[PDB]
Symmetry: C2
Subunit: 211 residues, 2 copies
């Protein structure tokens, strides 16, 4: 019934998608937060592979990823696991945490680090002792994240934000402008769903990048 | 008002569907200009991830074969494009009639884009065959017309067909699966496209993944 929304905290377009969806959820439109890792999805070992060969959830939590294809390995893995921990406090706390962290990173330009996770938890009103205890369940949070990454791979998710409407209608939705106004957010969502439900079976609308 | 520019390649059935849609919309007053983008050129290894184009379809010999892989579509597509330019020298209506006839030969009849198909499309389009013959001897002029299309497409960043340039900086690739000829269905589909590109949210991409 809710639309599944795959996101990565790294990604400002995913931030805007989650902001849109949050305001729409205010009006009764159901959305469910799920994770897709850009580091894993774009990883050279996973390129042109029937089956995922390299998992973000196999990497040590404190490991430095380098400056190449894994440069954002550590912040995105840690952000994902903190968000799973927050989501154990229910849907409303999960949205509060995910939005707060997104905003710290993309509006306030803070790194996805421990200080940012802590500020997101207090901005979200989390029970901090419970959040702390859930974060100690690293293996369990990794299993949850791995399940999200598997569901994403089964759909062929390639970027964020990607919305699964159900019924086999799934699409990446990239837009530039932050849209929190309720009326504008509803217009934008209506454009998207209209495009996916058209009996013309629209697959792609995509602007090129000019010279 | 200026027509929408429609970049297509005869090889491509999504471009075919885009041209079929646009022809129906032109029937209600929506303006469209037919232009050419080469998928062979756009996907050529020498052009991959280049600031500037390094290999031009219009630089190639007319009987040259491109060779293995996608390059085998070099000679049909170049030759198809040139015949279309010669057809377009007989006016817009004859150009649409020729483009549609050739598209339908290739995608409905499954005929190769070869000389027999060009001749057949020219007769189906009702061209003046003698003027068409004479224009096809202006190989230099046709190559230069095609190069102008290809450079215009490169300046916009065109990467695939069909790509629609609405003017005002709103340009997008538009890929849809179902042949759409009904006037109302075509108008609704087109309103979807233009609404997406004119939204104040600055939508850049809506794109379905490919399930495993």
């Amino acid at each position: 019934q809710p639309t599944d929304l795959y996101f990565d905290f790294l990604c400002p377009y995913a931030w805007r998608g989650v902001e849109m969806a949050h305001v729409l959820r205010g009006s009764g439109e159901g959305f469910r937060l799920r994770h897709f890792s850009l580091v894993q999805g774009n990883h050279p070992q996973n390129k042109d592979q029937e089956t995922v060969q390299w998992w973000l959830t196999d990497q040590p939590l404190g490991a430095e990823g380098g400056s190449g294809y894994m440069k954002y390995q550590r912040p995105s893995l840690n952000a994902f696991l903190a968000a799973h921990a927050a989501a154990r406090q229910g849907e409303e706390k999960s949205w509060a945490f995910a939005l707060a962290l997104f905003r710290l990173h993309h509006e306030d330009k803070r790194d996805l680090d421990e200080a940012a996770f802590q500020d997101a938890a207090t901005r979200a009103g989390l029970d901090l002792s419970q959040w702390k205890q859930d974060r100690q369940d690293e293996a369990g949070l990794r299993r949850e994240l791995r399940a999200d990454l598997e569901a994403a791979a089964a759909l062929g998710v390639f970027g964020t934000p990607t919305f699964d409407l159900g019924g086999g209608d799934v699409a990446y939705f990239k837009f530039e402008e932050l849209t929190r106004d309720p009326q504008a957010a509803r217009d934008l969502w209506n454009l998207f769903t209209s495009t996916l439900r058209s009996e013309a079976r629209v697959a792609t609308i995509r602007r090129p990048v000019p010279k």
